[PDB]
Amino acid sequence: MAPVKVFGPAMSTNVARVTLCLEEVGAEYEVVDIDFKQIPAFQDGDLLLFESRAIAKYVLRKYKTDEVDLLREGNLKEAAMVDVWTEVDAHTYNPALSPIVYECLINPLMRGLPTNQTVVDESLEKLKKVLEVYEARLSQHKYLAGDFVSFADLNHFPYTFYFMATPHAALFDSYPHVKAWWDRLMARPAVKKIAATMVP
Amino acid sequence: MAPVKVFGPAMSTNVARVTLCLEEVGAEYEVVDIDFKAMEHKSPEHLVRNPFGQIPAFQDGDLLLFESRAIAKYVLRKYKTDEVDLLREGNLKEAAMVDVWTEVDAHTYNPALSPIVYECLINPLMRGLPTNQTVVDESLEKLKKVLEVYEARLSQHKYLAGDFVSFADLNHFPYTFYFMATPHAALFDSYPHVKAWWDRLMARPAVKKIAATMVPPKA
Amino acid sequence: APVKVFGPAMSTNVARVTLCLEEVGAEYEVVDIDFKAFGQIPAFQDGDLLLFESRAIAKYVLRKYKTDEVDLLREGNLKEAAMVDVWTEVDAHTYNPALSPIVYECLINPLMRGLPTNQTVVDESLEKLKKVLEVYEARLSQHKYLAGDFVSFADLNHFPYTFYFMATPHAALFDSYPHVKAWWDRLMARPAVKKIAATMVPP
Ligand code: NA
Ligand code: NA
């Protein structure tokens, strides 16, 4: 009984990370669009949580099944692969890619101001070195942590999806194994539901 | 001849297919510039009458048509005479060659050439997107193979269906014209019987007339 | 002097050609041979003349054997011929691109090529096919056949690939579209269609 509730700009990457996870576990949830003064807020009965990645993990743990276990916290080695590539997103991939989408989308559209090209070109060069590594990893496996989708892959969706709305979306075609992995994600039923809540 | 009406943007390849056919049969017509696709919301009449959103729309008195190839053929049939018979439906053998090379355009040539037009022109102009060069290279390699067959065919005949211009050749003009406006025009130089055929088509008065109409707007 | 069709009889492009020959009551013989050992799949020989490409051949057949009882192209009636033409184009560029990859994924790849069914291609094609069938449902509630109140080349073109779609796990999708199923059963009750359907079951 009782769905959970996610309070936040229902197009933010922060909310998306959480909603994507809820969909993958089949949790009934409600999104209440609100902008505030940790971007997403989360209520489960009396319990109230903030912060994207912490709420995602709470969700994946709470609705974890033998069949849908996206953290693999019971298999040490699989959980280490989930964890390392979640860290790669947070400290290597996203810092190179998220400025591209903040400059090319949110700076003109939302927080109206011109697109800074020095930062975009620098982020593109760093992203290119990131994707080189991704290209090798995803030649060995279909997903980041191995041959099973996981939190690590899901963590990549929200910002990449907006990157795929910049004039640079085609950069991934220069890396056919990453492209295919991206395409593998975009076809998951749960991803396209969340993808439909986005696009400025 | 109560002038027939074509509805769509004249820059569009599907509009150009139809107006080239009208020009070649000498028919009176006018082109009403309007982009129904850009209109997300429609009347119940439109969606019942054109549920697939075929382009252009064509009006001949009380008759309403969509889909450029069907319209083009309607126009070639309606205004056909002994001196301009672009379908040859009288000659079973000639009609078969018109049909054959119309299909090659539809399923072999246009699929290889048209992505280059979108990547190199329609995208970095009317949508702002840069040119996906991975798409361009794959398409050029596909197109080179196609053009080897056309090269051979047009060394035996001046036109695709034989030794007479037909619907088959007219079908190739709209996308190829845009292709020839890109830096990739140079590719035809390696297929001298294809280039000579292209030049023969570009020299036709009806084609020069429709080519003039394929310029982007202004304001 | 019967005409000759060269290709595998189970092929969709052979079936397109032989359905037309059946409907026009022409005498012909099929010569099984896989000529790829453009490469248009059926080869067709009418004594002096030799054609390729199944749609050009089908129209040649319908043209040559044209009678008043059997006029499957309606070229003497500009308006009827335009409806034949539009719905032949919908097949070629809208209907067949949505439906044929299901036939290939569920049927051709496992059985002939020896490759399992890619469910991602199937699901994506199913989503496309559903939107197409919505429009066909609307069209076939207004008319018994795609071009109007008469069977035409346009209906004949849909037979080969749809026949194979009906052998996939997704055949039942057509029940969700009652006017289309009603149209499909009308085609399946035609005698010429019954004959060609029997030729499309290889060992
Ligand atoms: Na066609
Ligand atoms: Na097509």
Numbering used by the authors:
A (entry chain C): 1 to 37, 54 to 216
B (entry chain A): 1 to 219
C (entry chain B): 2 to 38, 52 to 217
Paper text:
They are long established to catalyze the conjugation of the tripeptide glutathione with diverse electrophilic and hydrophobic compounds, resulting in their modification to display higher solubility and less toxicity. GSTs that belong to the phi class are dimeric enzymes, comprised of two identical subunits.
Sh101 and sh155 were crystallized with two and three molecules in the asymmetric unit, respectively. In sh155, high flexibility was observed in the same region in two of the molecules, while in the third one sufficient density was found that enabled the building of the entire loop between β2 and β3. Inspection of the crystal structures of sh101 and sh155 shows that Lys93 can form a new salt bridge with Asp62 of the opposite subunit. For example, the enzyme variant sh155 could potentially be a promising candidate for the development of a butachlor biosensor, since it combines low IC50 values with high catalytic activity.
